[PDB]
Design a protein around this ligand. Structure first.
Ligand SMILES: Nc1ncnc2c1ncn2[C@@H]1O[C@H](COP(=O)(O)OP(=O)(O)OP(=O)(O)O)[C@@H](O)[C@H]1O
Ligand SMILES: Nc1ncnc2c1ncn2[C@@H]1O[C@H](COP(=O)(O)OP(=O)(O)OP(=O)(O)O)[C@@H](O)[C@H]1O
Ligand SMILES: Nc1ncnc2c1ncn2[C@@H]1O[C@H](COP(=O)(O)OP(=O)(O)O)[C@@H](O)[C@H]1O
Lengths: 526, 16, 514
C-alpha cells in the first residue's frame, strides 16, 4: 500500500480487501450466480493524526467512485426543530435518484463521517429520561437500512471513542467491519520519512550528511503529522540559516543555496520546534526540580537504587505487567524532586505528571475526567510511567469533619488495579505526606511497595549540606560547627534553603547570629 | 436542551 | 508614524513577508505556501488604517481595493452577492494570463463584522468564503480586515487558510492626541480668540479614552459656554449686542464642559485607594516601626533572591487593631509595577465557584508582570466561617492552599500578604504551615501610649488631658485604635461639661485585659 502515499499499514489494508472488497472485483457473472450482497459500511478508530482520512480518501479513488461527500459530526446539530434530520437526509438524495433512474447499472457513492460518536449515542430506554439527540439516531438508522433498498452506497465512519456508539448501528447489516490504526513502529516511521523526502531527493537538495535511518530511531512516539511538521520545520530552518549567513558574509548566494541541505537543520528542529503528544517532555523537569539534587547523605542513594530496581522489574517481567510504589515522608523532605528524578532516569518513551496545580477551581467530576484522560492516553504506548503528586490535595482533605471527595477516591482505587491491554507495561509513582490517613481509608494495601524519605538528623550532615551549597566561609563554618556539633538536629532541605536566604538579607556582621537564632526557634525533635 | 419552538412568518407583496 | 509597535511590525514581517523574497523557482521545488489572511483588532484609531497604507506602500502591489462599510448590501435579489465577484475579476485574469509571475493583490476590509457574522448575509458570507477559498486556488491575493469586536466574527472565517494572522493593535496615546488638539485649536489661536490661561497639555492629559468626535465634542462644548454669556434670552430672543464686540474662551469654560456636559464612552480609570486609609497613620509607639521594618526586609528579599521567587507573610492581631491599613501602607511603599487588593466587599451573594473564578483571574493578571505584590484581607470572611458546627466552604480553602505554593513563570517574582484576626482557626485547618512567616499587631497597653495617641490626634486640650492622665496613668489599658476613635467621636457629641465624664465612663466598660 506504500505506492499510493501511505506507509506503515499493510496488514490493516490486506484484511480490508478480504473482508469487504473481494466481491467488487470478482467477475460479475459468478457473483450474481452466488447471490451475495456487498458490505455496506466500515468503522475506523484510533489516536488522531495517524492517517484515517487519508486512507478513506484513497479507498474510494481505488474503486473508480464519484467524489466523496465529507461530513463533520459536530456541525450538523441545529437548535430549531427538524433541521438536523433534514441535514442528515440531504446526503442520500443523489444516490436514491440515480438508482431509481438507472436500475442496477449505476455508479458508486461514498459518504465519510468524521467524529461520528458526537451524534450517535446509546438511546435511553427509560421513559422520561430520553436523550436530546435521539431523533438524529433514529433518522440515521432508518436511512442506512430501511424498507426501500439501496445497493449503490458505501459509508465510512471515523471515531476515537468506539465504546460510546449505539449498538444497533454495529450489527452485521450496518457497519460490520472494524479496524484499528495505532502509532507507527520504526519501520512505519522509516517508510513515512521516505515518502515525505522523495521530492527533495528528486530535486537534489538532500545532502549526503543526512541519514534518514538514524533519524528514524530518534523519533520514538511520533505520528505521521508530526513527522511532516518536522520535515517542514527543517526546511524553514535551512532557509533561515541561508538568509542570515548570506546577509552577514559576502559570499555568492548560489554557494549558500547549495549549503541549505545540511543535517544541522534537522537536529535543531527535533529539539526546539516539535513537541510530541505521546512522548517525553523536558519542560516539566525544570519546573519540578528547580535546584538540582545534592548528595548530603546515604539515604538518597538508597532511594534511587530502590527506584532503579523497580524500573528494571517493570521492564523485565511477564507475570506482573503493572507495578505501584508510594513515597512517604515528613513535610518539606523533598518527595516531588526524587520522584521526578526517578522518572527522568527511567528512560521510557512515555512519561507524564499529574498534579493539582492545573485543576484550580475544578469540580470533582472534571478532575475524574482529567485523570481518566491521562490514563487512557498512557494505555496507547508499549512502556509507560505516570506520577500522581500530593494525593491528599486531590482528595480535598481537611482535618475538621473530616471532609473529602469520595468520587475521586473510588476512581483512584479502581484505577490502581486495572491492567493495560495485552503486552503493554505501566509504572505508577505516588507521593503523599500523611500516610496514616491513607491507611485509614484502606488505600495503603492497593500499592505494592513503600519508600521512606527521611529528614536531616545530625550536625555533620547539616555541615556537609552547607558545604555543598557553599554559602558560609571558613570562620563562620567553624563557629557553626562548634555551636551545633551536637547531633540533635531536625530540619528539611526545602526549609533549610529558605532559612539561608532569609539570613543572607542582613548586614555582613549580623548574619551568623540570625541564622543560629532562626535554627534554634525551629523544632529539634520529632 | 429543548429545541426551539415554532415561529410565525411575515410576508411581502410585489407588483408586476 | 507609530510608536510602541516595533516588535509587532517585526512579527508581521517575520510571519508572512519573510518567505516572499525567494524567486518562484526555489519555492516551487519546495512547495511552501504563503499567507493570505490577516486580521487586526483593537479600539478605534488611525493606526490600523495607517498600517494598511504602509503595507500598500512597501510592496510592488496594485492600487489596493478598500470597501467602506456594508456597501455590498442592496435591495434587489442577487445584487448583494454580485458586488463580490467583481472584486476578484482582475485577480482571476492576471492568474490565468501571467500565471505565477503575477503581481500581488491586496484587499482591505473596513468594519468587516458588518457584512460577516438573513438570506442576504448568509449568501454574502458563503460567496466570500467560496471566492477566497474555492475550487480554484489563488496564490497572489491578500485580504486584510479590521475590527473592534473580534468575538462577533464568524468562526468559519478563522479556519486555517482563511484568516492566518491575528493582530492586536493598541490605542492612540497622549502625544498624538496633543497633535490633534493643536490642529483643532489652530484656528482660534490664529485669530486671538483663545485666552492665554489655557494649557493644552493639561487638557490632553485630562482627556483619557476619548475619540476625535468626542475630542471635537469637548472643544465645541467649551465654545458654547462662552457665547451664552452674550445671549440675553429668557423673556425674548434678544441679545446684548454690546458685549458682542469681544469674545474669548477661558480655561474654566473647558473644565466645566468635561465634567457636567460631555462624558467618555469607554468609562474611566476609577480608583478609591484611599478607601483603605481614611485617617492616615500616626506613630504612637515602637510596634509600628517594627512592623514597617519587617515589611521592608521582606520586600527586599523578593526583589533580590534567585532561589525563592515566591514569598508569603501573615498579619496577626486582635479585632479593631488596624491591620488592613498597615498592610496597604506596606504595599504602597513596595513600589512595584503591579499592585492589587482582593477584598470580600466586591463579592456579596456570590457562590463558591464565583469566588474561585474571581481569585483565579486576579492571580492570572498578576502572573503576567515581572514583579508583583498581592494582598488578601479578612481570610475568615473570604471562606465564610461560623463557630457553630463549625461551617465553611472547602472549595475556597483548597484553592487558597494550592495557590499559596505555585511559583510564577520562570524569571518573575511575586509577593503575597494575608491579614486575619483568628490565628487558632487557621492553625487548626493546617493553613498556618503554608505561610513562610508571621507578624504580630498589638493593641494599646499602657496609659502613656494612650496619652501620646490623644496628643497626636489633638482632640482634647491641656485642662482635660491633665485629669485624664491623673485617672489613667496609674493603670494598664487594653483598647484598639479604631474603637478609640469611635469612643472619642461618640463622647464629643454632648456639651463641653459632660465630655470628660462620658469618655471615662465608656472607657471602663470597653476596658479589659488579655
Ligand atoms: N537531595 C535533595 N532532595 C530533594 N530535593 C532537593 C535535594 N537537593 C536539593 N533539593 C531541592 O529541594 C526542593 C525540594 O522541594 P519539593 O518541592 O520536592 O518538596 P516536597 O517534599 O514536595 O514538599 P512539600 O510537601 O512541602 O511541598 C527542590 O528545590 C529541590 O531542587
Ligand atoms: N497607627 C495606625 N495603625 C493602624 N491604623 C491606624 C493608625 N492610625 C490611624 N489608623 C486608622 O485606624 C483604622 C484602622 O481600621 P482597620 O479597618 O484597618 O482595622 P482592622 O483591624 O482591619 O479592623 P476589623 O477587625 O474591624 O476588620 C483606619 O482608619 C486607619 O486609618
Ligand atoms: N501513514 C502515513 N503515511 C503518510 N502520511 C501520513 C500517514 N499518516 C498520517 N500522515 C500525514 O498526516 C496527515 C494528517 O493525517 P489525517 O489523514 O488527517 O489523519 P487523522 O484522520 O487520523 O487525523 C496526512 O494527510 C498525511 O500528510
Amino acid at each position: 500500500f506504500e505506492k499510493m502515499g501511505i506507509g506503515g499499514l499493510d496488514k490493516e489494508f490486506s484484511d480490508i480487501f478480504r473482508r469487504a472488497f473481494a466481491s467488487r472485483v470478482f467477475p460479475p457473472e459468478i457473483v450474481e450466480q452466488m447471490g451475495c450482497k456487498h458490505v455496506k459500511g466500515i468503522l475506523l478508530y484510533g489516536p488522531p493524526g495517524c492517517g484515517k482520512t487519508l486512507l478513506a480518501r484513497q479507498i474510494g479513488k481505488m474503486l473508480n467512485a464519484r467524489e466523496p461527500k465529507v461530513v463533520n459530526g459536530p456541525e450538523i446539530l441545529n437548535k430549531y426543530v427538524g433541521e438536523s434530520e433534514a441535514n442528515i437526509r440531504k446526503l442520500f438524495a443523489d444516490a436514491e435518484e440515480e438508482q431509481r433512474r438507472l436500475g442496477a447499472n449505476s455508479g458508486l457513492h461514498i459518504i465519510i463521517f468524521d467524529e461520528i460518536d458526537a451524534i450517535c449515542k446509546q438511546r435511553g430506554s427509560m421513559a422520561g429520561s430520553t436523550g436530546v439527540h435521539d431523533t438524529v439516531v433514529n433518522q440515521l438508522l432508518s436511512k442506512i437500512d430501511g424498507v426501500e433498498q439501496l445497493n449503490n452506497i458505501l459509508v465510512i465512519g471515523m471515531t476515537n471513542r468506539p465504546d460510546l456508539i449505539d449498538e444497533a448501528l454495529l450489527r452485521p447489516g450496518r457497519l460490520e467491519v472494524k479496524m484499528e490504526i495505532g502509532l507507527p513502529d520504526e519501520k512505519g516511521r522509516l517508510q513515512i520519512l521516505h515518502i515525505h523526502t522523495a521530492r527533495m531527493r528528486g530535486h537534489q537538495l538532500l545532502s549526503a550528511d543526512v541519514d534518514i535511518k538514524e533519524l528514524a530511531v530518534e523519533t520514538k512516539n511520533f505520528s505521521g503529522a508530526e513527522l511532516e511538521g518536522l520535515v517542514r520545520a527543517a526546511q524553514s530552518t535551512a532557509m533561515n540559516r541561508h538568509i542570515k549567513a548570506s546577509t552577514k558574509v559576502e559570499v555568492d548566494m548560489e554557494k549558500a543555496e547549495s549549503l541549505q541541505v545540511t543535517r544541522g537543520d534537522f537536529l535543531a528542529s527535533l529539539e526546539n520546534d516539535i513537541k510530541p503528544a505521546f512522548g517525553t517532555n523536558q519542560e516539566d523537569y525544570a519546573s519540578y526540580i528547580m535546584n538540582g539534587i545534592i548528595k548530603w547523605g546515604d539515604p538518597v542513594t538508597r532511594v534511587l537504587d530502590d527506584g532503579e530496581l523497580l524500573v528494571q522489574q517493570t521492564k523485565n517481567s511477564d507475570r506482573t505487567p503493572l507495578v505501584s510504589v508510594l513515597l512517604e515522608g515528613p513535610p518539606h523532605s523533598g518527595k516531588t524532586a526524587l520522584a521526578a528524578k526517578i522518572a527522568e532516569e527511567s528512560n521510557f518513551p512515555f512519561i507524564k505528571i499529574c498534579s493539582p496545580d492545573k485543576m484550580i477551581g475544578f469540580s470533582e467530576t472534571a478532575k475524574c475526567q482529567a485523570m481518566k484522560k491521562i490514563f487512557d492516553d498512557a494505555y496507547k504506548s508499549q512502556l509507560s510511567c505516570v506520577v500522581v503528586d500530593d494525593i491528599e490535595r486531590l482528595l480535598d482533605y481537611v482535618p475538621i469533619g473530616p471532609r473529602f471527595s469520595n468520587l475521586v477516591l473510588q476512581a483512584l482505587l479502581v484505577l490502581l488495579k486495572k491492567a493495560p491491554p495485552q503486552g503493554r507495561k505501566l509504572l505508577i509513582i505516588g507521593t503523599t505526606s500523611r500516610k496514616d490517613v491513607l491507611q485509614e481509608m484502606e488505600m495503603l494495601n492497593a500499592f505494592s511497595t513503600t519508600i521512606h524519605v527521611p529528614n536531616i538528623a545530625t550536625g555533620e550532615q547539616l555541615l556537609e549540606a552547607l558545604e555543598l551549597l557553599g554559602n558560609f566561609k571558613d570562620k563562620e563554618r567553624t563557629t557553626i560547627a562548634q555551636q551545633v556539633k551536637g547531633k540533635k538536629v531536625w530540619i528539611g532541605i526545602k526549609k533549610l534553603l529558605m532559612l539561608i536566604e532569609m539570613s543572607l538579607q542582613m548586614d555582613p556582621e549580623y548574619r551568623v547570629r540570625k541564622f543560629l537564632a532562626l535554627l534554634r526557634e525551629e523544632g529539634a525533635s520529632p | 436542551m429543548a429545541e426551539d419552538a415554532d415561529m410565525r412568518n411575515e410576508l411581502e407583496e410585489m407588483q408586476r
